[PDB]
Design a protein around this ligand. Sequence first.
Ligand code: HEM
Ligand SMILES: CN1C(=O)[C@H](Cc2c[nH]c3cccc([N+](=O)[O-])c23)N(C)C(=O)[C@@H]1Cc1ccccc1
Length: 383
Amino acid sequence: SPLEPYHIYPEAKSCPVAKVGLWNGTPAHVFSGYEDVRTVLQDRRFSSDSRRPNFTELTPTLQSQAAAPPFVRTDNPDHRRLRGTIAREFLPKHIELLRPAIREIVQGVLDGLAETAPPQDMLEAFAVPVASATVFRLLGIPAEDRALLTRCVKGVVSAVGSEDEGAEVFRTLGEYIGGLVQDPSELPEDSLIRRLVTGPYQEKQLTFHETIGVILMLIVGGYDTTASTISLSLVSYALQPEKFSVVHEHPERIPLLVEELLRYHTVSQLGLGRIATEDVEVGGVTVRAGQMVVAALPLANRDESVFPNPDELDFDRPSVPHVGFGYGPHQCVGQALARVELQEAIPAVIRRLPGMRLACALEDLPFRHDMATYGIHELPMTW
Ligand code: HEM
Ligand SMILES: CN1C(=O)[C@H](Cc2c[nH]c3cccc([N+](=O)[O-])c23)N(C)C(=O)[C@@H]1Cc1ccccc1
């Protein structure tokens, strides 16, 4: 099954800590249990620092960056410093101020769609425009430039790309973004890029290339992870629309419902890698210093012991805390924004198009088995 994540690390079907080779052959202990995963991810002995001997990104494309990564591949003091430059933008209190804008962006797209004859690729026609417009508004990216940024993001996220292909992607992406860093003048005043450039960059809290790091990561997490999550939520809707009764009868439960989609559809499908900095016992296993590990989110999000009937999409759970956004210091800084988008986007589209069914067979859809984050390359829906 394409909607069940047990194919990624088949070894974990058999054991809660499972030894496996990564793309380049490096072995890595895969943690599949929720507590173990939570443990790995706030332990100081597991590091996101890619410059360390033996660090192995989960795809070759990302490997290409290890020697000079964005902040997602840093430890303190740098992590605190870099994340610090923009953390304040994504405080739930500030992101809430975007809700009506977001809600407008959504109504915008649904207004388009309402006149269009089905079927439609709801990725291209609903999820991506919502998601991308939202973060591009926040960032201040020119409209002109979004098709390109879109293309290049698919590059970064490829799990089939090579290390030399990935270098070029990032090179190209980086040169674009460097262009805005060096000339912020064409960007809106209420733009996150501009605040970052004229503020902490000019104040030299970070370098030119660190700045590009920051922005690049908001461009990537800002819409690809969000636009897929939307997409798959629709797939679940298409398959089981009377589970979504709630949207109509229980609006105050939408927030839960979103969480439950975050759990079920853990798009960070390969989990998160970490390197041990000294020997550490977790989940009854000693991890020798310098060993890679993988925190398998989507399986931790299906760990029956914490989530009864995990393979069932179930909006009647009392609030339960998925590690969809990860955990620890590197936990998704954009999580607040994506919650909002999903809260606004998914209800909207169900209400305006509740006969949304799949315009072709589940087994025919092109699921992203070749991407570092999951989802679908196209989602033909009729209604
Ligand atoms: C469904 C939506 C999203 C999912 C599932 C997602 C998932 C994640 C995960 C798992 C990480 C952990 C990386 C690690 O620990 O090694 C992460 C980090 C990050 N996410 Fe997201 N995210 C989403 C949305 C966003 C959005 C909307 C933004 C920005 C607008 C964003 C920006 C980031 C950044 C900058 C990081 C790096 C955190 C750090 O190293 O300090 N994410 N995200
Ligand atoms: C969960 N996840 C990832 O592990 C990776 C990130 C990454 C892991 N190692 C990286 C090395 C360089 C650049 C990036 N980058 O900019 O996304 C990376 N990507 C790309 C992803 O789409 C997702 C979501 C995400 C995007 C941006 C920053 C954090 C998370």
